[PDB]
């Protein structure tokens, strides 16, 4: 029941992206 963002590398670049459980 928590959410979080994260990094991920696409198109040689680092986006950021939000998540959740």
Same mark, same amino acid.
């Given at each position: 029941? #928590?959410? %979080? @963002?994260? @990094? %991920? !590398?696409?198109?040689?670049?680092?986006? !950021?992206?939000? !998540?959740? #459980?």
């Amino acid at each position: 029941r #928590w959410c %979080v @963002y994260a @990094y %991920v !590398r696409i198109r040689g670049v680092l986006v !950021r992206y939000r !998540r959740c #459980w």
